């Protein structure tokens, strides 16, 4: 086999504890290059003559070009050393260790996970493991209070087509008046984009971190919201913009007024004074040349303490976690310490970050709890919506992703289908509900945290920003209640089937030709299989199911009861029809 | 080219800054699969249609199975995204990016280094970059005061053969009196193994972390050592053992007496009560069943603060750094915070850890400065002493290990030939001085910090523990001043050639049959190439040297002048001879 293609490291996403005494190990090799992977391990101080423990590494998945093996090691000593034994299609065996490769186990060496400290066990809030988040764009969700609408606000109508400078008066009061709705839908948390004192429409340039923007409400209204949401079993998530502030931030305006006399001059990155100019900037900002967004020096103790204080103020109000913006642009020390602050105030506080690239460096367990799973969307958009990729490709994109980070993180990734910065997925589906409904079925049954974008649930459509930010449709007769009930049922199923929230993921079937994909979610002895027929034609498939995994399945969506015969399960799926098979365990 | 064998990551040892605006990048590939590696980069926020930067990745070296390419990206924005352009033997062009491989740049995606914060640019003390450490085991170095010799201390003789419980009276005063000797040798720093108050002989079971063991001296004596040593240009590095404490440790004893009602019960890992027993361990300890060494609970804030106070104390005495024992078993959060303390107290304090396996997780820049380079010892023992490997294998082992951690670490790794836990290298060489010297010449010219074990500079030989703890031979008549002088010359040269202390490493030539190896240290324009004739036979070698690096070289050890012609340098080395050719720049 190609040893130069096999990889592993005693850390990161290939070696990490899941418990105080259990070490997980991942090993990858060229697809087809290895057939069996076994792990021999023992305590690091074990006598060189003592016998080693054995652990079989199952094929956890495979992507475009790699094979992935995962095994669980029992380390009662909390210290472990181990070597890999890899067997090829031709029985050729070889040990893989820290030293390298060899036919003799001794010469291969041994990887070592020094010690497993309880504090370094990746731990995330339980309520998040089986949660469903609903993304709220305040300015467009509900106008509960007309008295705070900004001047020039436009009529709230379904036919309205938002313009970049539009206003609709969306506010926190509406979110409250509509809480019965979210509860009915079944969401367990609301994620709000920025809503803090700011002069712009987007509010990404914070002016006052300790205050709700007047057009949205006030502390009183916010406290009311949090309280009314909680008694409804709904957590609250706010957006944290700590990378940069607005040009009206008290600390910045002082520097604009006092130049080097400002006690806050080092709260930013300035090249020379005076500090200011239009189309030109003598201080670092978000992206390139954005005057309204002066970068904050999160490395500075003053800045750090201040934001940490800002977090305390809002955590005092009862929020349940944060969504970090441009998180990847603030120092790690800051994030490490922030989590400590946050987790000590609330062990169940969530920390979700937004990185548009491999976020492993932030997802080891000492910083964020998870991040937005943009990969999920990319694979989902192209699979159900544009159809640029087929089922076998879709399977790969997904798998490659799962093995990207530790399970504690993969399990909590926010899987969104769109956002306030993208065209609505229904539109991406060219308006076809058959395609949209299928995707949502997948979103609601896959590994991670489903993130619902306001309105998608009743079938709102629209191009990218700002057309995706159309005012929420509240007239029941103008809403797609058929769709609305679909989301409800999917959400209800996801709540009862433990496998769907806390189960692993395994690919079941991938037909590049028929474009049908299947996977199974597992927890304990329970198994739930999902079959997706992504084609505008009726198709029939043959899935394999050895009696050991059950002999009869019940389609949780239709009640239909199918039986497997001779280790196979015959299934006929209707156009864009999805099936969710439960084995009753 | 086996694509499944190419590796990279925008973190760790494959992507790291060397300055606030300079990012280093490394790529791994199957040997021979890539002949040209170039990187195309731009600002993370740069427009799509903007001209991409170019940076050629030179081949940094190769090992047993891989090739390694390196590049330095100029990133004025401290923000960068990049894509690799790989060229094979047959001219095939493949792009490599976060998304994967493709003949098209757009489909390859791009790796991203989100942001470069100065607080994250690996930084190590300046004096350690040109330092030459000297390992001292107090008990066997020198007896400056017999009044502290424990009963049973034996005579100080060259032919003395120490037993496990022997006592010679080595003490700090002794070190003081011998400072002139050490200063002459040219060592710039002194490293003491544990020397704190302990009831045992080895002193690994700390009883009083705030006091020097009476057998070595008193606090006032240590102070005398630091000042007198400092004025000779010699630093002091103390060995700290925080993973576990002694069974006589004040905090521990409180539990042995008050049992469960011990105010310090949560400071350790205690299974059940009574708190202890003989030959049987009912509490976690170092290794397996070590009643005198109960593991300290560093995860505990009370312990952390205490160990830190202990740290502050000794740093207030003026020490210059720490050598951590069994550090790989202490939580990272602890070390991260330890560094912050130590460094704030003294930015020049050194933090060297001891971990016998891939320590990348501790060598990112937020924890240790370096570790003992055990891989170096193995490469020198098998190449110089046992002859287990030839010149080509030596080359690989060296190359592979060099590429394990970021350059800032590699440059400051402690390169030891032996220690209080092994036999004298001379013993490993079977008494062959011609071999010992060549290994030392390499040690003195390779990348890393040379570690000299007390006595080795005067040719002390001996078997492993306790024979490696033989009393220092101070009788000049009995000293191999011949070797001693050699040691001196190398140390001098090292201090005069910036490239030997701060330059990189590149293999120059390797021959498995002739057993001849050569490498080049380069810094700015200075080049110094080392040629090793590791064979007991006079050999001639033809090295390739384009006029670019110079056309004339000088052997610093003999003063011989060598000239190159048509890009070749013909050198004749005597049995086991090594040359150090300076390009005069
Ligand atoms: Ca309003
Ligand atoms: Ca003495």
Swiss-Prot record, chains A, B:
Task: Write down the SMART domains for this protein, in alphabetical order.
Answer: Aamy
Q: How is the cofactor bound?
A: Binds 1 Ca(2+) ion per subunit.
Quickly give the catalysed reaction.
Hydrolysis of pullulan to panose (6-alpha-D-glucosylmaltose)
Which GO terms of the molecular function aspect are on file? metal ion binding; neopullulanase activity
- Positions contributing to Ca(2+) binding: 143, 145, 148-149, 169, 171
Where substrate is bound, by residue? 244, 323, 420-421, 465, 469
Enzyme nomenclature, EC number: 3.2.1.135
The domain of life is Bacteria
Pfam families membership: Alpha-amylase (PF00128), Alpha-amylase_N (PF02903), Malt_amylase_C (PF16657)
Q: Which residues form the active site?
A: 325 (nucleophile), 354 (proton donor)
According to the UniProt record, which cysteines are disulfide-bonded? Answer: none
User: Which InterPro entries does UniProt cross-reference here?
Assistant: Glyco_hydro_13_cat_dom (IPR006047), Glyco_hydro_13_lg-like_dom (IPR004185), Glyco_hydro_b (IPR013780), Glycoside_hydrolase_SF (IPR017853), Ig-like_fold (IPR013783), Ig_E-set (IPR014756), Malt_amylase-like_C (IPR032091), O16G_dom_2 (IPR045857)
Residues flagged as site, Transition state stabilizer: 421
Q: Which CDD domains match?
A: AmyAc_CMD (cd11338), E_set_CDase_PDE_N (cd02857)
The UniProt entry, under Gene3D superfamilies, shows: Glycosidases, Golgi alpha-mannosidase II, Immunoglobulins, Oligo-1,6-glucosidase, Domain 2
Q: Which EC main class describes this enzyme?
A: hydrolase
The biological processes this protein is annotated with in GO are:
carbohydrate metabolic process
Cofactor(s) listed: Ca(2+)
Alphabetized UniProt keyword annotations: Calcium, Carbohydrate metabolism, Glycosidase, Hydrolase, Metal-binding
What role does it play? Hydrolyzes pullulan efficiently but only a small amount of starch. Endohydrolysis of 1,4-alpha-glucosidic linkages in pullulan to form panose. Also cleaves (1-6)-alpha-glucosidic linkages to form maltotriose.
Q: Which family does it belong to?
A: Belongs to the glycosyl hydrolase 13 family.
Quaternary assembly: Monomer.
Q: What is this protein called in UniProt?
A: Neopullulanase 2
Source organism: Thermoactinomyces vulgaris
> Lineage of this protein's species?
Bacteria, Bacillati, Bacillota, Bacilli, Bacillales
- Give the gene symbol: tvaII
């Amino acid at each position: 086999m190609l040893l130069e293609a096999i990889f592993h490291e005693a850390k990161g996403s290939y070696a990490y504890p899941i418990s105080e005494t259990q070490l997980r190990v991942r090993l990858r090799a060229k697809k087809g290059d290895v057939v069996r992977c076994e792990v021999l391990y023992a305590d690091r101080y074990a006598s060189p003559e003592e016998e080693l423990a054995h652990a079989l590494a199952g094929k956890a998945g495979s992507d475009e070009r790699f094979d992935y093996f995962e095994a669980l090691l029992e380390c009662s000593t909390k210290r472990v050393k181990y070597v890999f034994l890899l067997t090829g299609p031709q029985g050729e065996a070889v040990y893989f260790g820290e030293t390298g490769f060899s036919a003799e186990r001794s010469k291969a060496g041994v990887f070592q996970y020094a010690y497993i400290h309880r504090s370094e066990v990746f731990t995330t809030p339980e309520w998040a493991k089986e949660a469903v988040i609903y993304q709220i764009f305040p300015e467009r969700f509900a106008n509960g209070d007309p008295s705070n609408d900004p001047p020039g606000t436009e009529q709230w109508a379904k036919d309205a087509r938002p313009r970049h400078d539009s206003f609709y008066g969306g506010d926190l009061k509406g979110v409250i008046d509509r809480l019965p709705y979210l509860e009915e839908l079944g969401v367990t948390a609301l994620y709000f984009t920025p809503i803090f004192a700011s002069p712009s429409h987007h509010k990404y340039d914070t002016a006052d971190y300790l205050a709700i923007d007047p057009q949205f409400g006030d502390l009183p209204t916010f406290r009311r919201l949090v309280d009314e949401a909680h008694r409804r079993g709904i957590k609250i998530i706010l957006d944290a913009v700590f990378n940069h502030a607005g040009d009206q931030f008290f600390a910045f305006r002082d520097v604009l007024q006092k130049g080097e006399q400002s006690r806050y001059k080092d709260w930013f990155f300035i090249e020379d004074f005076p500090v200011s100019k239009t189309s030109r900037t003598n201080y670092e900002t978000y992206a390139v040349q954005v005057p309204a967004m002066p970068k904050l020096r999160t490395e500075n103790p003053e800045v750090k303490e201040y934001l940490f204080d800002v977090a305390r103020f809002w955590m005092e109000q009862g929020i349940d976690g944060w969504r970090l913006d441009v998180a990847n642009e603030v120092d790690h020390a800051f994030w490490r310490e922030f989590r400590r602050l946050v987790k000590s105030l609330n062990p169940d506080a969530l920390i979700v970050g937004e990185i548009w690239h491999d976020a492993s460096g932030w997802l080891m367990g000492d910083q964020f709890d998870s991040v937005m799973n943009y990969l999920f969307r990319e694979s989902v958009i192209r699979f159900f919506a544009t159809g640029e990729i087929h089922a076998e490709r879709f399977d790969a994109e997904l798998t490659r992703a799962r093995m990207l980070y530790p399970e504690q993180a993969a399990q909590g990734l926010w899987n969104l289908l769109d956002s306030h910065d993208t065209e609505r997925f229904l539109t991406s589906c060219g308006g076809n509900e058959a395609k949209f409904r299928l995707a949502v079925l997948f979103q609601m049954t896959y590994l991670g945290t489903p993130l619902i974008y306001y309105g998608d649930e009743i079938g709102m459509a629209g191009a990218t920003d700002p057309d995706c930010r159309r005012p929420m449709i509240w007239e029941e007769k103008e809403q797609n209640r058929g769709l609305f009930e679909f989301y409800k049922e999917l959400i209800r199923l996801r709540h009862r089937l433990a496998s769907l929230t806390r189960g692993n993921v395994r690919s079941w079937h991938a037909d590049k030709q028929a474009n049908l994909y299947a996977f199974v979610r597992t927890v304990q002895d329970q198994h739930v299989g999902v079959v997706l027929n992504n084609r505008g034609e009726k198709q029939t498939v043959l899935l394999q199911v050895p009696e050991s995994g059950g002999k009869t399945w019940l389609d949780c969506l239709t009640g239909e009861e199918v039986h497997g015969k001779q280790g196979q399960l015959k299934l006929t799926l209707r156009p864009y029809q999805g099936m969710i098979l439960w084995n009753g365990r």
